[PDB]
Design a protein around this ligand. Structure first.
Ligand SMILES: [Mg+2]
Ligand SMILES: [Mg+2]
Ligand SMILES: [Mg+2]
Ligand SMILES: [Mg+2]
Ligand SMILES: [Mg+2]
Ligand SMILES: [Mg+2]
Ligand SMILES: [Mg+2]
Ligand SMILES: [Mg+2]
Ligand SMILES: [Mg+2]
Ligand SMILES: [Mg+2]
Ligand SMILES: [Mg+2]
Ligand SMILES: [Mg+2]
Ligand SMILES: [Mg+2]
Ligand SMILES: [Mg+2]
Ligand SMILES: [Mg+2]
Ligand SMILES: [Mg+2]
Ligand SMILES: [Mg+2]
Ligand SMILES: [Mg+2]
Ligand SMILES: [Mg+2]
Ligand SMILES: [Mg+2]
Ligand SMILES: [Mg+2]
Ligand SMILES: [Mg+2]
Ligand SMILES: [Mg+2]
Ligand SMILES: [Mg+2]
Ligand SMILES: [Mg+2]
Ligand SMILES: [Mg+2]
Lengths: 144, 155, 150, 129
RNA sequence: GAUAGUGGCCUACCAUGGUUUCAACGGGUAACGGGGAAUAAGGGUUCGAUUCCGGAGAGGGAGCCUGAGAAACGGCUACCA
RNA sequence: CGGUAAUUCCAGCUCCAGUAGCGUAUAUUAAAGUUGUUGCAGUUAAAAAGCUCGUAGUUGAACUUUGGGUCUGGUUGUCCGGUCGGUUUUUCAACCGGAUCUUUCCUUCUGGCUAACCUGUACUCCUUGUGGGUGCAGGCGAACCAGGACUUUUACUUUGAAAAAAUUAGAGUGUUCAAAGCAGGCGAAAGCUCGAAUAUAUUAGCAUGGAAUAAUGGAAUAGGAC
RNA sequence: AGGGGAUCGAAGAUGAUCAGAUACCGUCGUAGUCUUAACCAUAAACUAUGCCGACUAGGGAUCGGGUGGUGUUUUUCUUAUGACCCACUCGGCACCUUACGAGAAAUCAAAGUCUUUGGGUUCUGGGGGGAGUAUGGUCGCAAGGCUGAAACUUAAAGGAAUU
RNA sequence: GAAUCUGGUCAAACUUGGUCAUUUAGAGGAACUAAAAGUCGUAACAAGGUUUCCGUAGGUGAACCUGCGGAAGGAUCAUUA
């Protein structure tokens, strides 16, 4: 029995069949179609710099309720517009309109985090300095 | 292959630097040059006695058999003086611990010293490049008659 | 378990152990051979001849008594047909079906059956070519098939 | 179609053993099968076996003591290359102390230990423990 | 004929072949190839622009001079940018 | 988790983890028997083509030399250390070979060397001997070549030859240790001296041993073999 | 596109019922239902169980065939059939009880002979949505069929059983 | 023996078209997802109050309804003689 061929000269069939099947595995598909380059706002890169258009509070999904404090960013490298969450309690009032910002992914590999709908990106650095540093009061924002 | 006539095209076809002195008359009248290829292979009587020409014959021409000596079944005789040889082999795919059946066609040159049909197994020797694709020259045809002795079933 | 139907049957003749001629049977192998030849002349296929031998006479199997199978014997004498027997029969069957189809067109079951028969014939033809009983180019069609039959 | 005869035989034997029977009736019978049986006999996994002559294929009656806990062919007879035997052994056998991988070499059909001793390898057949 | 020489390499005359479901041909590559690298029961999977070995290229395409050796660009000639 | 006792937010104090490091992002590998050759599933969780035919592909019953015997090489356990913790045989073993003989050719000759005695030509150096060898006409040829003559063809497996160095595995060696490096070490410390190993890579080609497994080929108008 | 057009009846009318009711119920009623030439190629086209082969466990049934019964009846005296009756046997549609095997379980004589993993093979699946959609082929007179994505989205969708 | 010059040859490039590929403005249109204190019903889950499904055709405001054939994943493993 068993669906596969077994014979000592099958080989080719085993190969081709495996290849065919591989396309149902999502990661593999992504790798091969190259959807990290063609689609996706970051050009298959770990980080991206963009310019802040405006500051937008986003209402969280259910069980929860709280205005999340995100930022609408337009990335420098391609010109694509994305929403980016600004972490920590203050921090939204470190950003301002027309400011250069360094965005990382959220930590779900393209997918949205937690309860914040349509947001796939963090804010790491504003005007060249780390948000965390600012928050902890280790450095100051050197204007814009 | 040749197929009849011999002196059949725009130029006179002779073995280069073979002279047949037209004063003192010989037994053969025209001298035929041949050589044995070596490697244990035998120059056929069809090559020595024949009236055909060929520069690209390994027996009566100028090419020399050296390097690789391959064997395989004949696929096509259609193009003049040459042949196509199929060469079945097994390619080992290591991941699946098994074998693919594979192919590779070798175009080879056929001396008019041979009768070659499609399906005959042929021993072919490597030589100097002869055309765009040909590097090989037919040395021995193994399928001699097939069933040309007793073709008809009636005892 | 059958070649074209879902059928799974096991009905067959079961040849006895002893290759030697049965103890009760007298006669002679030569006589048997002669009889076979006569039958062939009359115009019978091997199987039929065998059946006849089994029934009217003391012949269990021809190979048991003579040393040779009937077809071989026929060949030796120069009597084995242009087309092997089974193949011929198949062809005949196919022809009948074709004829039927010609007459009545809406018989789809019949048509289906015909296809099967054709396939079988093709298989047999291929086998024969490989063994070189048929001339290695012999093909089966329609008009030609009919001609062969008749 | 009966693609493998040896396999069939082995399966039958296994079935017999599991259900506790003391004898099997193997039905097609070959040289290879016989050889396999002999190896088992030598190693004491099997009792006396005898070959009935049908004047066609054959038929083997095998006595089982009860020690044999699994036969098993490994089917597409992989060409095992001396250093590769070890891997096979590791895979198929339940321990490192006992059990045999039967492999057909040009030196004949034998268990893996014998092959090692003789320094020969070939195609794999089956296994017993 | 040309070449250092073999060869449709090119030319004349002739023949109709050659490759292909054991994927030819086409398309893609965010592809230089290999030694190797990461992982690490066994089997694998992914990576290899990069110190060694091959190969290409000197903005792009051509074309050549000198020379044993270059179709060279820290040589020349042209066109496009 | 957070709607008034928040072990989850923001702090303070305690505490835990890793530590000159630890965190975050995106790939990628392991986890994944969630790509499955090893090794997955398909009645109901995703999944058996509506059904049959069918070229390629993959796969495909059994069957040809098996059995005995005769010697003969080893290789470790044993039987004592016969010995100056090591080393030699026998009582013995299983194990791996080699030669044969069994109705058995192992490719065959055209010759070179015939080693050897199948020999026996003088028969004796000589314990009463078939212990032993100066010795050459008939001739065993396997002790090797050097040439034919053609050898069914593979797959498989074997040992060998090649798969550059670095990398990898790994021997040696107190870079003070280590990552490393290919150094070093010993003297009278007058000069001497080990080193710089090995092993892997299987795809393809080459070489040879094997002849189980799997295939192919031969004599059926015999135009068959001697 | 012809022929047929009794019944039943997508559309329609049309009478009720309802807040609405061009829905269920009622009465009519073209197309269709039947057929002849073409087309279409899909169904919960389901046993939701691919095909070929081997083996493992009892039990009665039953259909098709075949054997052995001085078995019963038929009766035109032996009869000879036929029909029964018993026993065995191949092939089939199933079923019943146990699983010592499987399985998540429901259940399964296969869905068994699978971590004690390899009889031969073809096809299909790889979380849920987006979607059998978009697009490009191709086949259809058309309806449609076969082929078949991605972006984005989401922590479940599901299966069998439980109180 | 330089300029110059006749034919070639290699052949960059340029003018006007055509073509394939990838992009890119894009009046409008038709989607799906997310948020699920809007509006109209209640289609499905109980025989869900006309048993559900499925293929197909027609019809509708919307679930949907109605033919014809099918399937229990049905509310029936059941009526001997
Ligand atoms: Mg059968
Ligand atoms: Mg079939
Ligand atoms: Mg590139
Ligand atoms: Mg690469
Ligand atoms: Mg590289
Ligand atoms: Mg690059
Ligand atoms: Mg530059
Ligand atoms: Mg240049
Ligand atoms: Mg420069
Ligand atoms: Mg330079
Ligand atoms: Mg508190
Ligand atoms: Mg992984
Ligand atoms: Mg799975
Ligand atoms: Mg399903
Ligand atoms: Mg066989
Ligand atoms: Mg190391
Ligand atoms: Mg109505
Ligand atoms: Mg009304
Ligand atoms: Mg009504
Ligand atoms: Mg369907
Ligand atoms: Mg189905
Ligand atoms: Mg999915
Ligand atoms: Mg449920
Ligand atoms: Mg309702
Ligand atoms: Mg309802
Ligand atoms: Mg379902």
């Amino acid at each position: 029995g068993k669906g596969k061929p077994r014979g000592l000269n099958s080989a080719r069939k085993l190969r081709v069949h495996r290849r065919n099947n591989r396309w149902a595995e999502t990661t593999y598909k992504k790798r091969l179609l190259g959807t990290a380059f063609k689609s996706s706002p970051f050009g298959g890169s770990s980080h991206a710099k963009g310019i802040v258009l405006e500051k937008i509070g986003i209402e969280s999904k259910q069980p929860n309720s709280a205005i999340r404090k995100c930022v609408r960013v337009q990335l420098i490298k391609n010109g694509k517009k994305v929403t980016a969450f600004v972490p920590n309690d203050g921090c939204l009032n470190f950003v301002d309109e027309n400011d250069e910002v360094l965005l990382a992914g959220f930590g779900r590999k393209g997918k949205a985090k937690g309860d914040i709908p349509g947001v796939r990106f963090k804010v790491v650095k504003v005007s060249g300095v780390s948000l965390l540093a600012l928050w902890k009061e280790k450095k100051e924002k050197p204007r814009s | 292959s040749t197929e009849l006539t011999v002196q059949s095209e725009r130029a006179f076809q002779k073995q280069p630097h073979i002279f047949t002195n037209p004063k003192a008359k010989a037994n053969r009248k025209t001298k035929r040059w041949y050589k044995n290829v070596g490697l244990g292979f035998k120059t056929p009587k069809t090559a020595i006695e024949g009236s055909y020409i060929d520069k690209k014959c390994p027996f009566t021409g100028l090419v020399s058999i050296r390097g690789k000596i391959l064997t395989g079944t004949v696929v096509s005789t259609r193009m003049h003086r040459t042949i196509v040889i199929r060469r079945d082999y097994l390619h080992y795919v290591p991941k699946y611990n098994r074998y693919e059946k594979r192919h590779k066609n070798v175009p080879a040159h056929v001396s008019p010293a041979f009768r070659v049909q499609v399906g005959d197994i042929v021993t072919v020797g490597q030589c100097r490049p002869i055309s765009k694709t040909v590097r090989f020259n037919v040395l021995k045809v193994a399928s001699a008659t097939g069933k040309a002795n007793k073709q008809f079933a009636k005892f | 378990g059958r070649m074209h139907s879902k059928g799974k049957g096991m009905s067959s003749s079961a040849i006895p152990y002893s290759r030697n001629a049965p103890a009760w049977f007298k006669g002679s192998s030569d006589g048997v051979v002669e009889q076979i030849i006569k039958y062939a002349r009359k115009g019978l296929t091997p199987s039929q001849i065998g059946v006849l031998l089994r029934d009217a006479h003391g012949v269990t199997q021809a190979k048991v008594i003579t040393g040779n199978k009937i077809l071989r014997i026929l060949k030796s004498n120069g009597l084995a047909p242009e087309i092997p027997e089974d193949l011929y029969f198949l062809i005949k069957k196919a022809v009948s079906v074709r004829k039927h189809l010609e007459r009545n067109r809406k018989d789809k079951d019949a048509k289906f059956r015909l296809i099967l028969i054709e396939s079988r014939i093709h298989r047999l033809a291929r086998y024969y070519r490989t063994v070189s009983v048929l001339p290695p180019n012999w093909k089966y069609e329609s008009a030609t098939a009919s001609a062969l039959v008749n | 179609t009966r693609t493998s005869v040896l396999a069939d035989a082995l399966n039958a034997i296994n079935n017999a053993e599991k259900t506790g029977k003391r004898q099997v009736l193997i039905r097609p019978s070959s040289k290879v099968i016989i050889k396999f049986l002999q190896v088992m006999q030598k190693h004491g996994y099997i009792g006396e076996f005898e070959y009935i002559d049908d004047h066609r294929s054959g038929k083997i009656v095998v006595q089982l003591n009860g020690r044999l806990n699994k036969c098993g062919v490994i089917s597409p007879r992989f060409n095992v290359k001396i250093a590769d035997v070890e891997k096979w052994t590791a895979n198929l056998l339940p321990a490192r102390q006992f059990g045999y991988v039967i492999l057909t070499t040009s030196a004949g059909i034998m268990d893996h230990e014998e092959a090692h001793r003789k320094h020969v390898s070939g195609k794999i057949l089956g296994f017993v423990y």
